[PDB]
Design a protein around this nucleic acid. Sequence first.
RNA 1: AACAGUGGUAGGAGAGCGUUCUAAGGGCUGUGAAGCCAGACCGGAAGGACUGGUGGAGCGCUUAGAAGUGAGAAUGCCGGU
RNA 2: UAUCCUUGGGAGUCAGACUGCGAGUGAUAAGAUCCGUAGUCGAAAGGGAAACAGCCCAGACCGCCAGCUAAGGUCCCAAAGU
RNA 3: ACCGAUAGUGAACCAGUACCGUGAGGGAAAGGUGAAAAGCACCCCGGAAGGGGAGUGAAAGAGAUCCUGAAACCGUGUGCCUACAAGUAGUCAGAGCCCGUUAACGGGUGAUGGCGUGCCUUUUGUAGAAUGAACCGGCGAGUUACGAUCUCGUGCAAGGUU
Lengths: 49, 142, 117, 54, 109, 101
Amino acid sequence: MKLHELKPSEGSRKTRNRVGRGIGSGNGKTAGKGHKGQNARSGGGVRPG
Amino acid sequence: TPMANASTIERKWLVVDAAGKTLGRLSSEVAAILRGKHKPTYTPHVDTGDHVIIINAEKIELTGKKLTDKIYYRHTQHPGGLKSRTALEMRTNYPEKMLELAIKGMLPKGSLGRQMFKKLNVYRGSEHPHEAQKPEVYELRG
Amino acid sequence: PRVKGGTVTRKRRKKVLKLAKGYFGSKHTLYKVANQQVMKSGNYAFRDRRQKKRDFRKLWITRINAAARMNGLSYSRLMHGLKLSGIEVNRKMLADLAVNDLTAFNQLADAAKAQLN
Amino acid sequence: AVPFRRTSKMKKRLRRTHFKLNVPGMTECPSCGEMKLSHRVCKACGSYNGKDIN
Amino acid sequence: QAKAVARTVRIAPRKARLVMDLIRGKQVGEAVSILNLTPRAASPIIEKVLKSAIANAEHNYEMDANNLVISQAFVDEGPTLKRFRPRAMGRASQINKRTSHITIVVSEK
Amino acid sequence: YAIIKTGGKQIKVEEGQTVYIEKLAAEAGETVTFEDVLFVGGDNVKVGNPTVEGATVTAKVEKQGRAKKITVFRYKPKKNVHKKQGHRQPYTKVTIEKINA
RNA sequence: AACAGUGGUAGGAGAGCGUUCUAAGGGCUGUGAAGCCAGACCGGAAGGACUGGUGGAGCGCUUAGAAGUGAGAAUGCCGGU
RNA sequence: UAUCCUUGGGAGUCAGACUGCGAGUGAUAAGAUCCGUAGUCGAAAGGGAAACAGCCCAGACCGCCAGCUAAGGUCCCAAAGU
RNA sequence: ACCGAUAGUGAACCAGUACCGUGAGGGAAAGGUGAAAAGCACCCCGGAAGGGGAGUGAAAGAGAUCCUGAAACCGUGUGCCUACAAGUAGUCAGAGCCCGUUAACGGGUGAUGGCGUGCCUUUUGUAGAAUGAACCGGCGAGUUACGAUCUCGUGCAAGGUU
């Protein structure tokens, strides 16, 4: 392993599924959390059980 | 890569006479000639037609009760401004708008419509001033 | 490390203005209005690449009408004739290219007229 | 009393047709040779019609 | 050719395209006189600059001042002075003083 | 003057004229024969769907490049859909020769 | 190679583009970089160059890593108009 | 013909519309409302119904200046038989 | 593997000032000439302001809110088009005229024709007479800290690991 040619074992690294940048990738406007729900607002919502 | 003729058109002068026919079917195949759709070099946008002279327009006929029924409605812009004219009114008072208005609907609308519409003229009786162009005689398909 | 984001944008907004020449008035120096017009052109430039499959037929077929009425035939009796005259493939564009050589066109027409009868 | 839309750069610059102003009636001073206003006193000459009037 | 710029004397430019849409193309020896009975007062700036524009062609260039025609005389606006006029019921309208760069290009006929 | 079928399209063909025709199985120095010929013209010899017999008009393949660039930007107006795909259509610069009339 | 399929919102899944910073190599610059300004170049796409003109000191690539990670809409903030 | 089930990560959806047949509510009134089963639309552009989510045809990888049909059309706008 | 002047302390600069408020308090804006002030003597225009020359400096378009200087916007000129056409302003056909570029099925105008009702949010449903934005530029929204759980991946494995 040279410093010029660093690489992982394929499957040990995986890029971000980063949320809310443009409608092209998907997850653009709603950002993965749908339309107007309680489960879309700023932290407001439900306990687990 | 077709041929789009633009102002390289040998235009023509046909005369269609109005002896005893119906003005729908007498304006029918004239209106194709006004755009020249019978001519093989038909571009759809550079007015490939040719000029049409109609003689004896007041002697044109209508079956049914259309001599009394088909009221020709023009309208002003002032309120309540329709002016009704019946067919026999148009027939005898002045018929030189009676075949023009039957073709103004039949030529396609736009700037090119009026540009093709200048090729038309209609003379009451047997005037035909037009002794300087050698006009031809056309006979419709029916 | 913080991103300034200086020249990520200003390179992109002029890849839309340089696709926006010639427009009327204030649609060639604005991003927010020409970008509603580069998009709107895209449907138009798409859906009017398929009317050249249509408004060329409508340009080709009436010329074949016009070649037929100097022969007494219809558009029907030509194309129904040519299916029986030969089994010919003459693809209405290039049918007009024989029309502008009309001396040779009517040998294709009257052969079908004989095959009409 | 509200402009419903902004004025574009056509209908603005079609309103500055009859906002132009001309050159006034301008003749030549018959005595001191310079350009004179019509029917007033050529102030370089100080004259009008025959007389440099004091 | 010659060149002379007024450079940031205070007048509003849309009160200075008007008289400047007469002067261009004219004879310079005539345009001193056209700029004299204007009555609009965006002229004693310009007439005090066209008279300066001739002198550059006469001193620095000696180009026979009776044979000159203005080819370009274009007015472009300069930096502004922002005021706050007080108004009705606390409204504080903005009055924009404008300033313009009257330029004059003199060339031989 | 030939009317030859190459890629399902036909062209009114004059000998000695370059016609932009579809991509095919040559390597820019070949004389590919076109056999689906009809309405030879000039002497007005047609054959009605057989081809004209023994008349396989050749050409000479000059160049195979791509077209001027066409980009589709097909957006659906509401509901947030874009689709941005370029398309370089390849062709073959065909120099036509040898009418085999 | 053969056969088949390719409209898509919410929604899941997979590939890549690019900015800032660092990391080893390499190079490229006062014989003119970054930026800016223009075009008719190429890549399927985000895109990427190549001459020309500005500018007067720095910045790309190859592979990696870290992210304040990319705008056109918030009765958006702040200037300029 | 290949799609089911099981285990597990991840969701969104829980306001729907209309046309035909099968009912209720109504006045056998609504482009009304409450459902049944079936469509389309929602999320589906194209063609006709002059234009028109919801009816009648039909699903769009992308290019050509080629070919055939469906719904509907063939005197002229507006392509095709007076 | 911090920021580079709208960022970073509110405050890189006479900043807790200037201003707002009787008041407790609130609380801005604004850095860059060159390497060296050598920063324009001298001649003209005008009362200057301000130039045009000259001279300085490698650059003076570098000359006093002084590096680079985009867009809004204001323009001055000219190539092609327009005063019988309705026209989300384009597309695609398309002559004429004007052209000669990162040399290739070119560049720019387009008389005229055919199809054609913006983007976004929210909706059963939108060109909408439902909202949102005068445009122009910059900033501005799913992040880490700790633990849970699953897949992918690593090393040892009936022992792994501090």
